[PDB]
Scaffold this motif. Structure first.
Motif, PDB file in Angstrom:
ATOM      1  N   UNK A 211      52.657  54.604   6.120  1.00  0.00           N
ATOM      2  CA  UNK A 211      53.713  55.447   5.549  1.00  0.00           C
ATOM      3  C   UNK A 211      54.427  56.261   6.616  1.00  0.00           C
ATOM      4  N   UNK A 212      53.701  56.723   7.631  1.00  0.00           N
ATOM      5  CA  UNK A 212      54.361  57.606   8.587  1.00  0.00           C
ATOM      6  C   UNK A 212      55.244  56.830   9.559  1.00  0.00           C
ATOM      7  N   UNK A 213      55.001  55.527   9.728  1.00  0.00           N
ATOM      8  CA  UNK A 213      55.825  54.668  10.580  1.00  0.00           C
ATOM      9  C   UNK A 213      56.463  53.532   9.776  1.00  0.00           C
TER      10      UNK A 213
ATOM     11  N   UNK B  81      58.442  64.393   7.066  1.00  0.00           N
ATOM     12  CA  UNK B  81      59.225  63.856   8.168  1.00  0.00           C
ATOM     13  C   UNK B  81      60.544  64.577   8.305  1.00  0.00           C
TER      14      UNK B  81
ATOM     15  N   UNK C 158      41.219  56.946   1.660  1.00  0.00           N
ATOM     16  CA  UNK C 158      41.378  57.402   3.043  1.00  0.00           C
ATOM     17  C   UNK C 158      41.512  58.925   3.112  1.00  0.00           C
TER      18      UNK C 158
ATOM     19  N   UNK D  59      39.270  55.996   9.640  1.00  0.00           N
ATOM     20  CA  UNK D  59      40.634  55.480   9.755  1.00  0.00           C
ATOM     21  C   UNK D  59      41.475  55.867   8.525  1.00  0.00           C
ATOM     22  N   UNK D  60      42.813  55.909   8.705  1.00  0.00           N
ATOM     23  CA  UNK D  60      43.789  56.232   7.647  1.00  0.00           C
ATOM     24  C   UNK D  60      44.969  55.260   7.780  1.00  0.00           C
ATOM     25  N   UNK D  61      44.718  54.000   7.407  1.00  0.00           N
ATOM     26  CA  UNK D  61      45.655  52.919   7.685  1.00  0.00           C
ATOM     27  C   UNK D  61      46.914  53.034   6.843  1.00  0.00           C
ATOM     28  N   UNK D  62      46.763  53.271   5.541  1.00  0.00           N
ATOM     29  CA  UNK D  62      47.936  53.429   4.677  1.00  0.00           C
ATOM     30  C   UNK D  62      48.757  54.644   5.101  1.00  0.00           C
ATOM     31  N   UNK D  63      48.098  55.790   5.290  1.00  0.00           N
ATOM     32  CA  UNK D  63      48.829  56.987   5.700  1.00  0.00           C
ATOM     33  C   UNK D  63      49.532  56.731   7.024  1.00  0.00           C
ATOM     34  N   UNK D  64      48.849  56.035   7.933  1.00  0.00           N
ATOM     35  CA  UNK D  64      49.496  55.656   9.180  1.00  0.00           C
ATOM     36  C   UNK D  64      50.725  54.790   8.923  1.00  0.00           C
TER      37      UNK D  64
END
Ligand SMILES: O=C(O)CCCc1cc2cc(Cl)ccc2n1S(=O)(=O)c1ccc2ncsc2c1
Lengths: 277, 10
Positions: free
Chosen positions: B8-10, A101, A271, B1-6
């Protein structure tokens, strides 16, 4: 020939911003790691795990972050090691995500594309940075409080004895390039911004940033490695070896899956690996 | 899907 113009001064400002963001994202830099690996430190002097007796005693004397007195631990050395490494990997995904980021332009990328770049880049970064902690004898563990030998890892029962060895092989060749943290900070940014990851949707702005990073890296390497004319190309080739490392590591993981039950990756890792390749 | 990675990014 090279010149000092507003472009190059932008490339250097970019290199320093990555470096500064890299120092605060990653705890153990390669500067600190190599000091430790030579005793050129005060700090601690890591506890060496070189056989089963030193392992048992190391678990007692090293304060492992993930271990509590007490959750339920595997009772089998190889699996307890797998568990520590899996915990460090999850941690590293977060370190790397935070660093991503900080890369100019990354946050303003398609959020779905941000996800895809991290999914594919994280383990290539992990093994890139793991080399900072390796010499030919072993690898620093537990924030540098311990040191686990290459031959001890190799001696773990199959298939665990095969996990770390390809990483050591990579690290010997890669460390002979003698990059420092300033080089590495830009190199990992380049990896994260690979515009050829499967499933990317808006590739243009990714290549744009990676272009700007590849320029900053080439300038970085020309300035920092006067006695290495072919360093930039050699480094790009190492991205090829890292994809192969990740591929090989995936194939060992599925051995674990249909063989060692009770074992299961942390869902973040699940994931990442799911539909990787 | 990549819920955790999603996440972390937000
Ligand atoms: O695949 C995953 O992400 C979870 C599993 C990853 C993993 C399990 C594992 C078990 C053994 Cl016996 C040896 C190496 C192993 N690796 S690894 O080579 O990838 C690794 C990763 C981060 C790290 N920090 C200090 S050492 C280190 C080693």
């Amino acid at each position: 020939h090279m010149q000092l113009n507003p472009e190059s001064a932008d490339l250097r400002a970019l290199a320093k911003h990555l470096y500064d963001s890299y120092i605060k994202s990653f705890p153990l830099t390669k500067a600190k790691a190599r000091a430790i690996l030579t005793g050129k430190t005060t700090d601690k002097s890591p506890f060496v795990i070189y056989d089963m007796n030193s392992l048992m005693m190391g678990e007692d004397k090293i304060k492992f972050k993930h271990i509590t007195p007490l959750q339920e631990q595997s009772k089998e050395v190889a699996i307890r090691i797998f568990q520590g490494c899996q915990f460090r990997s999850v941690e590293a995904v977060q370190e790397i995500t935070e660093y991503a980021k900080s890369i100019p332009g990354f946050v303003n990328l398609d959020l779905n594309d941000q996800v895809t770049l991290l999914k594919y880049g994280v383990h290539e970064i992990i093994y890139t940075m793991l080399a900072s902690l390796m010499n030919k004898d072993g690898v620093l563990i537990s924030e540098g409080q311990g040191f686990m030998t290459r031959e001890f890892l190799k001696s773990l029962r199959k298939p665990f004895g095969d996990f770390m060895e390809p990483k050591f092989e990579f690290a010997v060749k890669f460390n002979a390039l003698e990059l420092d943290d300033s080089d590495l900070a830009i190199f990992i940014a380049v990896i994260i911004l690979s515009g050829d990851r499967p499933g990317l949707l808006n590739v243009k702005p990714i290549e744009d940033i990676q272009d700007n990073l590849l320029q900053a890296l080439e300038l970085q390497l020309k300035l920092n490695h006067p006695e290495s004319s072919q360093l930039f190309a050699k480094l790009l080739q190492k991205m090829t070896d890292l994809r192969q490392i990740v591929t090989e590591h995936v194939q060992l993981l599925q051995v674990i899956k249909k063989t060692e039950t009770d074992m299961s990756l942390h869902p973040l890792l699940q994931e990442i690996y799911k539909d990787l390749y | 899907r990549h819920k955790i990675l999603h996440r972390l990014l937000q």
